């Protein structure tokens, strides 16, 4: 007739609050003979002895649930994990309260862990809603944390699956390095201007400082971050015009503990309605109703709590979390909008962009300049080295028509032959005439270069990694270094599956060359 509940807490005030909530749990549940005894454990700087003592005390206690409520740990590791693993050794449900890392979202390893604060991946859905509001498609996502970057980008891909659009650029690396300006300049050259960052305080500060250094914070740049990027020294270097996200009651442990204890009480009373009552042993036999009790918990529905409608998903996370929106207006946090469980409502306050007007800057750009690529075609593209220095001999045809050439840069020989020999040469012929006619027709410049090797391009998986990859003209076009391939390309389904074509200018087939 007794149910034990374990928890890890340091502050005596919260321990008394937990005891009071435990006492009140039996108030409106009638005069049933169910008894609730409260037990909590304190903090120790280490983790091996902490985990050992916690496991021993909880085994001797035969608890049903475990609560951890340490947001401000001096160690930045945020590791209540060993308690969750030891609880999963007997399939004992664990409900997190503070940490929002997506590592706990993985039930394949965290077999007996839940939490009521959604991870930052929901901020990806919030940003998708923002994109719906402001009609933005191409983004430039930069991530540093590989543990969640894959998960965050997976969430973004799932969101875009409705739109069937793509993030124009993604970036991932080892946090700690600082020579990131090359990738920043790579992103700056593109057309999209909406930049979304997701990292810790150090990397957020580093990228804000670099963007200010390279003047990536001018007009038209719309930024978008979460909560961790506008905290600590990252807030000190924060460039004005940024928009940030705020979690409602993020650290209000007083109400969070009350909501958790109420949920626990109602869930325990729901379980006691059914048969097959099992209790943990004193730690090689698992608790047989572990998954059964977790299934009982999954279907739980509540109408109580200051936060509101508390409900769990298949991942045991929180649903319909209301979010606050903050704008860095002259280095002061001004609320500019609110977020419902499914809709965003801006408040009466105005939002100022890093540049001028308060209207949304269209995050798109155009570039007449087009990097053209091709291969050395014997009758269509004639390649000639310069005469003396960067000059093309202005030879004429036999029909009074001057020969029009183009200054082309490419390797001299193959890699085994030429280690590194790339010189500006003179290119002309048939394709050059076609492209020059095109440039005459529509106003846009170009910059011709050559393919590093002599292949059209094949999809070859890595020799050992077996990672399919293209090369040649297709490889240089897929990599983004090429904007338009103008070459005697063979129209076929395999290549049309990856890129687009215009109507054919040529009609011919294949033959056999003999002597």
């Amino acid at each position, epitope marked *: 007739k007794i149910v034990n509940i374990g928890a890890v807490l340091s502050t005596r*005030k919260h321990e008394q609050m937990f005891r009071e909530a435990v006492n009140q749990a039996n108030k409106r549940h009638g005069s049933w003979k169910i008894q609730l005894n409260a037990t909590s454990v304190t903090h120790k700087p280490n983790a091996i002895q902490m985990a050992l003592s916690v496991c021993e005390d909880l085994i001797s206690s035969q608890v049903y649930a475990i609560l951890v409520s340490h947001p401000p740990t001096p160690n930045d590791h945020f590791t209540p994990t060993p308690v969750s693993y030891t609880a999963g050794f007997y399939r004992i449900p664990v409900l997190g309260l503070t940490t929002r890392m997506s590592i706990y979202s993985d039930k394949s390893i965290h077999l007996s862990f839940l939490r009521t604060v959604p991870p930052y991946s929901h901020q990806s859905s919030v940003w998708f809603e923002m994109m719906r509001v402001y009609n933005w498609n191409h983004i430039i996502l930069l991530v540093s944390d590989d543990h969640e970057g894959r998960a965050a980008q997976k969430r973004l891909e799932t969101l875009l699956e409705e739109r069937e659009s793509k993030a124009e650029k993604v970036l991932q690396f080892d946090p700690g390095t600082k020579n990131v300006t090359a990738l920043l300049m790579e992103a700056r050259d593109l057309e999209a201007r909406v930049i979304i960052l997701s990292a810790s305080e150090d990397d957020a500060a580093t990228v804000y400082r670099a963007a200010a250094m390279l003047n990536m914070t001018g007009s038209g740049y719309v930024w978008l971050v979460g909560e961790r990027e506008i905290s600590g020294n990252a*807030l000190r270097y924060a460039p004005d015009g940024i928009i940030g996200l705020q979690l409602i009651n993020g650290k209000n442990e007083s109400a969070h503990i009350s909501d958790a204890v109420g949920v626990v009480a109602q869930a325990v009373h729901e379980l006691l309605e059914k048969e097959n009552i099992t209790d943990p042993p004193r730690g090689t036999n698992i608790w047989k109703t572990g998954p059964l009790f977790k299934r009982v918990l999954m279907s739980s529905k509540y109408a109580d709590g200051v936060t509101g409608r508390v409900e769990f998903n298949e991942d045991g996370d929180r649903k319909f979390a209301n979010y606050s929106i903050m704008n860095l*207006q002259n280095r*002061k946090l001004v609320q500019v909008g609110i977020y419902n469980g499914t809709h965003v409502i801006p408040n009466d306050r105005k939002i100022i962009w890093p540049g001028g007007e308060t209207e949304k800057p269209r995050g798109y750009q155009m570039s007449t300049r087009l990097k053209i690529v091709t291969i050395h075609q014997e009758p269509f593209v004639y390649v000639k080295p310069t005469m003396s220095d960067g000059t093309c001999k202005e030879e004429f045809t036999v029909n009074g028509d001057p020969v029009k050439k183009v200054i082309c840069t490419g390797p001299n020989d193959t890699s085994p032959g030429s280690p590194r020999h790339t010189v500006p040469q003179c290119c002309y012929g048939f394709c050059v005439d076609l492209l020059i006619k095109l440039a005459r027709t529509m106003n846009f410049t170009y910059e011709v270069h050559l393919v590093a090797d002599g292949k059209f391009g094949t999809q070859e998986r890595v020799n050992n990694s077996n990672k399919k990859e293209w090369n040649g003209m297709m490889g240089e076009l897929l990599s983004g270094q090429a904007d338009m391939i103008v070459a005697p390309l063979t129209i076929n389904n395999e290549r049309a599956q990856y890129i687009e074509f215009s109507k054919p200018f040529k009609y011919q087939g294949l033959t056999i060359l003999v002597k």
Partner: antibody
Amino acid sequence: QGQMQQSGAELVKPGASVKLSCKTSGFSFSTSYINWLKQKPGQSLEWIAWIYAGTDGTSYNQKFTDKAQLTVDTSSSTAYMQFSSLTTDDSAIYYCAREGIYYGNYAGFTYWGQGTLVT
Amino acid sequence: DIVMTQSPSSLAVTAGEKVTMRCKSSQSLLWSVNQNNYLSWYQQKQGQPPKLLIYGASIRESWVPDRFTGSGSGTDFTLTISNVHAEDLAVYYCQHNHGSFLPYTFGGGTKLEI
């Protein structure tokens, strides 16, 4: 109406450290800004630092950047200022005040503590 | 630090008269984008925390009677009392509130005598 209550008077040996407390109530503790000001007797108040409770953003006076540290407790809505390496120059009255912001525009310090004298 | 110049340093008047106190900043407290002056007038009486009197160099607080009148813009500002009362006797300070112009500084102050 919001109330800010400070700690009692302190006698600290020179070179030692003191940590003052400032309990706040009657308003949104998380979404406001609190400032610590140093006021010697018969002298005007000297701004020391400000901190935002919602983001833990800290900014100190250059004269006190290496001398004072600020912390907050969301559970208690109480501000903290720890003054270390205390010297006789620190014999003064320290005050904690809540910023008044109207229409998102700062309008001055509207709320005050009772004051604390450190000897 | 923006130098805040207050004039006069002190004055004594009879009840019922009209007074004028000026505030001059070394730099323009007006931000062009929003056209607002980051100036705040305060009333500081003996033994009490200062009470926010006028912000934005023109807007009175809800508790401030209509007799107080703040004027001036840019670098020069003025606090004017149309009908001076004995209760108004205090030392009034003007302080800038421009976040981009940190740190916050105060003028020399004006002592009101009756």
